[PDB]
């Protein structure tokens, strides 16, 4: 499923992401845009045998278990398949753990590179939330 911008903004708001760990809703919408282009089925293979899964590109070495990644820690205690669902819930609940790790949203490279320090509110503007 490829979300629309405002569709995803409303979903993320319902999931309690607005101001989660201090990050306003726009940060999360922007992160999803640059991480996955709003695509819930996005995947990216990495050189360590891990894969990044889903709308927020959560990694299989540290966060979810895909059964094929060396050194798997599975800190979110979830199968990576659950992160490819059309509903965002499993991704969001894992993202809540990730953003709580100690370095905020810096865990998401695409967010650091294209969202951090920008006018992130633009991503929810017009959405009638």
């Amino acid at each position: 499923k490829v979300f629309g911008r405002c569709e995803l903004a409303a979903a993320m708001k319902r999931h309690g992401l607005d101001n989660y760990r201090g990050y306003s809703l726009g940060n999360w919408v922007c992160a999803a845009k640059f991480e996955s282009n709003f695509n819930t089925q996005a995947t990216n293979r990495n050189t360590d045998g891990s894969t990044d899964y889903g709308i927020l590109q959560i990694n299989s070495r540290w966060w979810c278990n895909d059964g094929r990644t060396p050194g798997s820690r599975n800190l979110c205690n979830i199968p990576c398949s659950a992160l490819l669902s059309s509903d965002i819930t499993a991704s969001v609940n894992c993202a809540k753990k990730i953003v709580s790790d100690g370095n905020g949203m810096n865990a998401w490279v695409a967010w650091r590179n294209r969202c951090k320090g920008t006018d992130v509110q633009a991503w929810i503007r017009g959405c009638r939330l």
Partner: nanobody
Amino acid sequence: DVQLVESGGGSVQAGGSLRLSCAASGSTDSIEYMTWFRQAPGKAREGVAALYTHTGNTYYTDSVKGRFTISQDKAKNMAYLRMDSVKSEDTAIYTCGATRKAVPVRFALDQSSYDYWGQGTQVTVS
């Protein structure tokens, strides 16, 4: 790929100070942590001090807390280890490590979390 190069090191008197430097080059944009490890004679490598480059947050092994300070110059892709108040037990080969993955803090002092390594530099406390 990322190249790491250490400078500094050598002899120091107990109670004294030494500064180590680590310069990163190559695919430096994706660097997440720069971290100092060490390996004392006859012992396994251990993480000493980790720095998360996008916030400046730092993580230390218990045996060095308060004595060693890791810092960076992010714009120049540098990490520094200031070793103050050195002890006998600090004699070791010190190695810079880096990674381009967003490693959870709890695993930031584990060597298996790191992808790139310097050459090692000897520090000897007399």
